[PDB]
Amino acid sequence: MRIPLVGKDSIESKDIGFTLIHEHLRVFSEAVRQQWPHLYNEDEEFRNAVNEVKRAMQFGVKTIVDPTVMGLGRDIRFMEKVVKATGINLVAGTGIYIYIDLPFYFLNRSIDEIADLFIHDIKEGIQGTLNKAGFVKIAADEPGITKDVEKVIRAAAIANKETKVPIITHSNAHNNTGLEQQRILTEEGVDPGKILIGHLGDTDNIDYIKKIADKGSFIGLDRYGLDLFLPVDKRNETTLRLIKDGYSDKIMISHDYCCTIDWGTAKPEYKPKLAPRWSITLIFEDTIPFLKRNGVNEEVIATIFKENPKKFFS
Amino acid sequence: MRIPLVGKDSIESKDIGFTLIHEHLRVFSEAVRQQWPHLYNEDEEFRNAVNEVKRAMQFGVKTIVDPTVMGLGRDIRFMEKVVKATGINLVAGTGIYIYIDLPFYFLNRSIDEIADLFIHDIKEGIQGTLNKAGFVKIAADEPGITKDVEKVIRAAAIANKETKVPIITHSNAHNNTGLEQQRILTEEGVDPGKILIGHLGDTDNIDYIKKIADKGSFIGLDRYGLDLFLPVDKRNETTLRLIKDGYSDKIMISHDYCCTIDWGTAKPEYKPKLAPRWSITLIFEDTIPFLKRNGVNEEVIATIFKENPKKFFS
Ligand SMILES: CCOP(=S)(OCC)Oc1ccc([S@@](C)=O)cc1
Ligand SMILES: CCOP(=S)(OCC)Oc1ccc([S@@](C)=O)cc1
Ligand SMILES: [Co+2]
Ligand SMILES: [Co+2]
Numbered sequence: 200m201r202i203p204l205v206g207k208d209s210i211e212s213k214d215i216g217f218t219l220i221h222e223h224l225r226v227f228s229e230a231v232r233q234q235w236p237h238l239y240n241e242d243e244e245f246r247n248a249v250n251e252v253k254r255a256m257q258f259g260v261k262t263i264v265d266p267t268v269m270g271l272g273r274d275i276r277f278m279e280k281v282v283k284a285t286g287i288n289l290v291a292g293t294g295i296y297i298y299i300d301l302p303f304y305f306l307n308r309s310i311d312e313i314a315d316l317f318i319h320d321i322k323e324g325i326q327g328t329l330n331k332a333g334f335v336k337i338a339a340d341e342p343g344i345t346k347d348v349e350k351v352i353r354a355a356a357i358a359n360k361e362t363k364v365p366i367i368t369h370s371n372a373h374n375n376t377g378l379e380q381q382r383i384l385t386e387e388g389v390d391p392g393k394i395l396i397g398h399l400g401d402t403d404n405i406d407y408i409k410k411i412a413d414k415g416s417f418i419g420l421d422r423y424g425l426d427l428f429l430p431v432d433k434r435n436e437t438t439l440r441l442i443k444d445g446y447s448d449k450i451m452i453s454h455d456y457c458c459t460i461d462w463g464t465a466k467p468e469y470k471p472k473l474a475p476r477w478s479i480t481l482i483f484e485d486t487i488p489f490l491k492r493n494g495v496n497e498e499v500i501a502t503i504f505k506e507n508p509k510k511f512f513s
Numbered sequence: 514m515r516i517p518l519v520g521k522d523s524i525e526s527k528d529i530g531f532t533l534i535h536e537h538l539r540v541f542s543e544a545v546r547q548q549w550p551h552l553y554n555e556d557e558e559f560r561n562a563v564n565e566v567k568r569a570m571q572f573g574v575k576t577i578v579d580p581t582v583m584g585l586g587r588d589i590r591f592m593e594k595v596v597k598a599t600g601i602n603l604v605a606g607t608g609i610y611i612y613i614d615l616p617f618y619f620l621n622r623s624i625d626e627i628a629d630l631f632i633h634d635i636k637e638g639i640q641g642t643l644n645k646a647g648f649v650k651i652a653a654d655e656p657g658i659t660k661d662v663e664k665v666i667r668a669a670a671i672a673n674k675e676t677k678v679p680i681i682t683h684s685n686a687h688n689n690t691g692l693e694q695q696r697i698l699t700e701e702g703v704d705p706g707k708i709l710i711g712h713l714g715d716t717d718n719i720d721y722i723k724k725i726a727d728k729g730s731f732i733g734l735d736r737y738g739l740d741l742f743l744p745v746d747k748r749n750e751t752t753l754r755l756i757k758d759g760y761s762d763k764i765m766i767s768h769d770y771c772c773t774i775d776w777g778t779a780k781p782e783y784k785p786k787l788a789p790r791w792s793i794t795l796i797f798e799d800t801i802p803f804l805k806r807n808g809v810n811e812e813v814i815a816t817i818f819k820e821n822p823k824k825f826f827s
């Protein structure tokens with residue numbers, strides 16, 4: 200069969216249903232959580248993940264793709280507990296989340312032994328369990344394409360050609376990282392249709408977004424609610440204009456919501472100023488309503504949240 | 514009383530005895546081990562640690578200060594089990610080990626709350642235990658003193674002024690990165706007598722080593738065996754010229770040995786060409802004899818390995 204699910208039997212990609220392609224049940228810094236655990240409360244972290252999933256499903260969400268990996272505190276056992284209490288289709292991934300340099304472990308190690316880490320997760324299981332990864336997550340940001348970042352990228356390029364699984368990327372919309380991720384992965388033999396260049400919905404600079412979509416890769420309008428990168432309105436006018444231009448087949452929409460996140464910028468007291476209406480159901484309360492009283496039919500909605508996720512994992 | 518011990522009552526600085534000031538039982542990258550535990554064998558790690566500590570004790574070593582902190586995989590419980598197995602005096606520390614940037618947890622976080630962590634480990638306990646940290650560890654390398662690195666340094670200073678525990682630093686010998694650590698720490702009100710600037714032993718430039726010592730801080734000739742930083746023989750002449758010029762009042766010696774280390778450079782086949790003689794006992798096999806073989810008497814040896822550590826922690 201097609202797609203691995205956490206705590207469940209793998210599914211035919213055709214049975215994915217309404218999908219949020221980019222959502223985090225919980226993120227934290229492994230290093231920080233290992234050394235200072237007094238800072239965390241996994242009971243509040245569970246109550247939060249459950250409730251945010253329990254809802255969403257009430258809105259008809261069938262599948263959630265969670266791109267929490269190394270650097271973000273992936274926890275297959277925690278994810279597995281959420282599933283028990285909600286019964287959601289959850290897809291976990293492999294990969295490394297860095298902006299500048301890889302952890303020391305990787306000093307003098309090759310691109311391949313990084314790839315073998317991803318491949319291990321996709322074929323054997325993740326973290327001692329038999330739950331396999333469904334995708335590879337890689338990142339790049341303000342610092343640009345460093346030598347270490349380029350390694351994690353080329354490692355993914357190998358994991359894809361090996362396990363066929365798709366590649367999700369985190370990028371900076373204002374600096375070209377997204378185009379570089381696509382540009383490198385493609386030149387390594389990866390099918391553009393298997394790459395989701397992420398966080399492209401942070402810029403209202405459409406000409407750019409289009410070139411990434413014109414080069415065959417899915418465009419991620421995936422941080423709805425985080426006004427600090429770009430407010431809801433300018434995101435909605437950006438999607439819309441793209442759909443109207445006939446790009447609804449590359450468009451993939453999500454929140455990037457973290458039911459719990461230890462990043463300081465995310466202190467439950469910068470919320471009102473940085474990301475006021477940010478949750479895992481904001482597209483149902485704003486985006487979808489907005490897009491339908493604006494000349495976009497249920498068939499296009501189905502293309503974005505159903506057909507596109509399916510194509511991505513097929 | 515003063516100095517805290519791992520799995521033991523707190524001793525008085527006078528009971529510290531012969532001490533290896535910089536040695537690691539086990540180091541790994543927290544994120545890597547958490548996500549891919551299949552790369553580690555915690556049975557090998559306990560056997561090597563217990564072994565090396567035993568041999569070091571058979572030479573008369575009574576106490577080992579262990580500067581493994583965040584970024585290097587500080588594991589209090591593992592340490593505590595090594596103490597139970599050998600009977601050693603183990604000094605565990607707190608702090609953050611980074612070259613460039615802090616974990617993502619620290620975005621939009623202040624120096625005070627970074628310091629609050631260190632103080633927590635010192636006054637309350639480590640990783641949920643009653644074992645308390647006896648010192649703070651910081652770092653800087655080729656990257657230099659970055660905005661984030663500086664934060665750790667200044668946070669260390671705050672913890673020091675609040676607890677009185679000393680500070681052990683990691684430094685690059687050929688870039689002044691150590692001189693700056695001293696600058697900043699002392700400027701912030703840290704008694705230079707409470708600082709140990711590490712890895713000065715990697716350079717034969719004695720003028721630089723003297724300047725740091727002259728300014729009232731201990732000098733770390735603490736990587737004996739790591740031929741890739743500096744061969745044993747050239748380290749020997751350097752530590753000799755320093756002792757002859759009367760600097761044993763600030764000289765501290767150790768190996769920075771890691772009974773197990775996940776860095777790709779520490780792969781047991783570079784050993785021959787990188788650090789063949791690198792052990793936790795090399796200085797007994799080569800260094801101490803060499804000194805006697807030459808000028809140094811047994812009164813100087815005591816001060817370097819017994820009195821200096823006693824000052825440091827007093
Ligand atoms: C500058 C970082 O912005 P913040 S932490 O802002 C939260 C108010 O937004 C983010 C940042 C990272 C993520 S990822 C870890 O899911 C999700 C949201
Ligand atoms: C052996 C691991 O790396 P190398 S050969 O140096 C490569 C930077 O030596 C080191 C480097 C760093 C350390 S830290 C863990 O005290 C210990 C030994
Ligand atoms: Co991202
Ligand atoms: Co060091």
Ligand SMILES: [Fe+2]
Binds near residue numbers: 221222223455
């Ligand atoms: Fe994300």
Ligand SMILES: [Fe+2]
Binds near residue numbers: 537580769
């Ligand atoms: Fe060290």
